[PDB]
């Protein structure tokens, strides 16, 4: 059973980190310097450090050498105990389902609980059900 290591990354650059290390692996699997990594875990609920799969601590050091996104947490590679290989894959309740209850972030109905009606397949806009709280143009000028 392979071990899991924790490396430090830039905040905001998790998916770019994963999509860059995957292309390094594919860019070096056929040379004289391959990569000994199995996978790299990047949860969407975290922000700041990622997870990597390797048997020994020298493999992560000889695999992440040369990347500028992982140059900060390069001098230290923490190790998790074996019971933490499972809590990493757990996701608590994507988040796109009709007839559900979402809230707003910007606009006038901030932090107001609404409902979804229809979803646009273009992934551009979404239908919402809220209640207007305007004055019907009586108080404002």
């Amino acid at each position: 059973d392979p071990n899991l290591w924790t490396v430090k990354c830039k905040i905001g650059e998790e998916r770019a980190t994963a999509i860059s290390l995957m292309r390094k692996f594919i860019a070096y699997q056929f040379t004289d310097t391959p990569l000994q990594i199995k996978s790299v875990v990047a949860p969407e609920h975290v922000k700041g450090y990622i997870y990597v799969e390797a048997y020994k601590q020298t493999h992560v050091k000889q695999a992440i050498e040369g990347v500028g996104n992982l140059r900060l947490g390069y001098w230290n590679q923490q190790m998790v105990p074996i019971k933490e290989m499972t809590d990493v894959l757990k996701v608590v309740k994507a988040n796109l389902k009709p007839k559900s209850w979402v809230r707003l972030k910007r606009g006038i109905y901030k932090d107001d609980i609404a409902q979804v009606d229809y979803v646009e397949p273009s992934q551009n806009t979404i239908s919402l059900k809220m209640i207007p709280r305007i004055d019907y143009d009586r108080i404002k000028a």
Partner: protein, 116 residues
């Protein structure tokens, strides 16, 4: 290979059979690399938007499914190494699951995420 890596981070989805995480251009030009004779999602956009959805989370760089602890837990060890997901929510309609049982493909719920 170079085809299973999504080129752009915008408009990417994940399937409900092998949790294949790619961009919307590769599911239409090439499709599901882990199932092409049972799904046939290359050559159109209705079948790509029908089975494969965007409601998914969690990203893993599967490289050696024959030797890794995560690949056996997600039952993705008999698949091609590449971009996969760990919780792909949703369900197939009662229009493509009936043909999968008669052909010998047991459609499993890949959603390992807990509900409340």
């Amino acid at each position: 290979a170079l085809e299973t890596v999504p080129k752009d981070l915008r408009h990417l989805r994940a399937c409900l059979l092998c949790s294949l995480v790619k961009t919307i251009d590769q599911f239409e030009y090439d499709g599901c690399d882990n199932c092409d004779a049972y799904l046939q999602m290359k050559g159109n956009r209705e079948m790509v938007y029908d089975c494969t959805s965007s409601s998914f989370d969690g990203i893993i760089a599967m490289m050696s499914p024959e030797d890794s602890w995560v690949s056996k837990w997600q039952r993705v060890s008999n698949f091609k190494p590449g971009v996969y997901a760990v919780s792909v929510t949703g369900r197939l309609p009662q229009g493509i699951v009936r043909e999968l049982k008669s052909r010998g493909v047991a459609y499993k719920s890949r959603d390992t995420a807990i509900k409340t």
